[PDB]
């Protein structure tokens, strides 16, 4: 048994997309089907379900209105078209075996699920600032400095400490996705507090998706 | 109709481990069918086991036998319980509900086969720099590395009264020494942060919390 | 997509996976269809003839399918669709009152 | 108001399965076997011994 989604993608507040789901490897004409969302970090949410012959179907508050379900059992292919795309769409779409049986339920198999991705803003290049100690704990002479990227849209931005000297003890961390709809990062390096005044602490910050290589005095 | 998991759960191979789902007062734990479902990390939710009683139920396509369940109508919480842990059985489980048309999931337990001494989370915060002040803005970062299994609570706090606004929290994610980073962010106008004497990072990890400061001074 | 007096909005991939004859362009004199086998199927071949039949028409089966999707019309030639969400932003600086003499 | 319009495509997409068979003319004929039949060949006679 095999479950393909397809039809997602990016889209922007509002608009419309259309999802795919090409079922094999069982009789795809006798089965229930819905469709399950597990939004980036999030547990399951049910959207939809649409029974095997196609006659009554089911949708979630949180979508009722604006998505709607169909099915060509002709063809093994199951469908979820979402109109007036919100921020809360954006997720992974699984598609599932919704079953009906005497007495017994469930989504039997899942598919590997495919990624929609609603965002209002277009392109946008970071913005980077120094974090200094400011306090000295002393644990073995052990300070702790780094820098903070704020607000980029695409996600690779790499990251280095005084152009690749500075590798011993750095830490760059996993990025946020803020309600802005833009990512921040931060990157911290443990520094001996013997070269606090002598050694140049700098930071080495690289976003090729707008061409932006910013290096700020950390 | 609310079905309730702890975010998290903890144990060595060998127990018998036991993930609830307490069932809100909508519904009677004893009449439901219940439903659920393993997740691993970089795959699809995997049918795990299907339960009304001990006489009706199912396990998933190649689930060991160690896996069973049960229900305690006094909490009208149902349970999924693992026989004889083994690595293998760390994911994520969620159990799941069919009430009139509805297909309600619960919160989801992450469970942990203990593979380590659990590691005390190693905090550091920072304030904000003096750049993006005279630029208007004041964010503050607070930074978790190091940390066992990828589980923490942060709370923000400022003169004593509990902020829930400019936060974005980063999930759990494992590094290179097999533990889990995570970082918080607090996000701020530069009036906004003079306002206040001081703040704090106030993270938990096993009801034990660790808690750093910054002032303005 | 235009069906018979009624209209709809199609996306793209959908519309280019429909299992139906077709050709590309407007007419201009016997237009060539494509994949003419969607709607007609040969059965039951005995040796010196095999029958065959037209499948019948396909406007429930598409209806069906573009069901929940963002409707239209036409008429005038240009006459489009009812969907919303206009986001504006109005001065009112030129904006007098009249009569407050 | 308006009418949906012809159901032909709908239904006979949904009939697609089941074993079925065509009539002319007001006699339902039928393709399907199994027909457990015994026979007595007692007074069957042959035509060429001699």
């Known amino acids: 048994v095999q479950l393909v989604e397809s039809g997602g993608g990016l889209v922007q507040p509002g608009g419309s997309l259309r999802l795919s789901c090409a079922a094999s490897?069982?009789?795809?004409?006798?089965?229930?089907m819905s469709w399950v969302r597990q939004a980036p970090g999030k547990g399951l949410e049910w959207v939809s379900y649409?029974?095997?012959?196609?006659?009554?179907?089911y949708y979630a508050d949180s979508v009722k209105g604006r998505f709607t379900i169909s099915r060509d059992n002709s063809k093994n292919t199951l469908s979820l078209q979402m109109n007036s795309l919100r921020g809360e769409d954006t997720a992974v779409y699984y598609c599932?075996?919704?079953?009906?049986?005497?007495?017994?339920?469930?989504?039997?198999?899942w598919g590997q699920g495919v990624v929609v991705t609603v965002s209002s803003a277009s392109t946008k290049g970071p913005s980077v600032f120094p974090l200094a100690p400011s306090s000295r704990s002393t644990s073995e002479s052990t300070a702790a400095l780094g820098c903070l990227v704020k607000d980029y849209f695409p996600e690779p931005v790499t990251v280095s400490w005084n152009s690749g000297s500075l590798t011993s003890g750095v830490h760059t961390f996993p990025a946020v996705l803020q309600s802005s709809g833009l990512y921040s990062l931060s990157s911290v390096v443990t520094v001996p507090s013997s070269s606090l005044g002598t050694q140049t602490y700098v930071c080495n910050v690289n976003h090729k998706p707008s061409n932006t290589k910013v290096d700020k005095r950390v | 109709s609310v079905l309730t998991q702890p975010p998290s759960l903890s144990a060595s191979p060998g127990a018998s481990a036991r993930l609830p789902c307490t069932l809100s007062?909508?519904?009677?734990?004893?009449?439901?069918?219940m439903y659920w479902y393993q997740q691993k990390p970089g795959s699809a939710p995997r049918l795990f086991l299907y339960?009304?009683?001990?006489?009706?139920?199912?396990?998933g396509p190649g689930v060991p036998n160690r896996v069973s369940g049960s229900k305690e109508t006094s909490s009208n919480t149902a349970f999924l319980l693992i026989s004889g842990l083994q690595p293998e059985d760390e994911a994520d489980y969620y159990c799941?509900?069919?009430?009139?048309?509805?297909?309600?999931f619960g919160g989801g337990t992450r469970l942990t086969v203990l593979g380590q001494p659990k590691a005390a989370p190693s905090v550091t915060l920072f304030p904000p720099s003096s750049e993006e002040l005279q630029a208007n803005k004041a964010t503050l970062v607070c930074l978790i590395s190091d940390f066992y299994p990828g589980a923490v609570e942060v709370a923000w706090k400022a003169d004593g009264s509990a902020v829930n606004a400019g936060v974005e929290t980063t999930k759990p994610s494992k590094q290179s020494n097999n533990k889990y980073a995570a970082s918080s962010y607090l996000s701020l106008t530069s009036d906004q942060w003079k306002s206040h004497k001081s703040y704090s990072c106030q993270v938990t990890h096993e009801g034990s919390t660790v808690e750093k400061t910054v002032a303005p001074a | 997509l235009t069906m018979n007096n009624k209209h709809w909005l199609v996306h793209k991939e959908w519309f280019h996976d429909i299992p139906l004859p077709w050709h590309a362009g407007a007419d201009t004199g016997t237009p060539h269809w494509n994949n003419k086998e969607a709607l007609v199927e040969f059965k039951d071949a005995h040796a010196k003839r095999q029958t065959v039949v037209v499948l019948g028409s396909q406007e429930g089966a598409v209806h069906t399918a573009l069901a929940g999707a963002l409707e239209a019309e036409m008429d005038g030639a240009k006459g489009r669709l009812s969907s919303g969400h206009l986001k504006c932003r109005l001065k009112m600086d030129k904006l007098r009152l009249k009569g407050v003499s | 108001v308006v009418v949906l319009g012809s159901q032909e495509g709908a239904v006979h997409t949904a009939l697609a399965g089941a074993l079925e068979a065509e009539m002319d003319g007001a006699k339902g004929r039928l393709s399907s076997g199994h027909l457990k039949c015994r026979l007595k060949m007692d007074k069957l006679r042959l035509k060429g011994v001699s």
């Open positions: 599932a075996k919704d079953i009906t049986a005497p007495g017994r339920n469930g989504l039997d198999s």
């Open positions: 490897g069982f009789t795809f004409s006798s089965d229930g």
């Open positions: 649409i029974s095997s012959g196609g006659a009554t179907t």
């Open positions: 007062s909508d519904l009677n734990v004893g009449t439901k069918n």
């Open positions: 339960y009304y009683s001990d006489s009706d139920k199912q396990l």
């Open positions: 799941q509900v069919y009430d009139n048309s509805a297909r309600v």
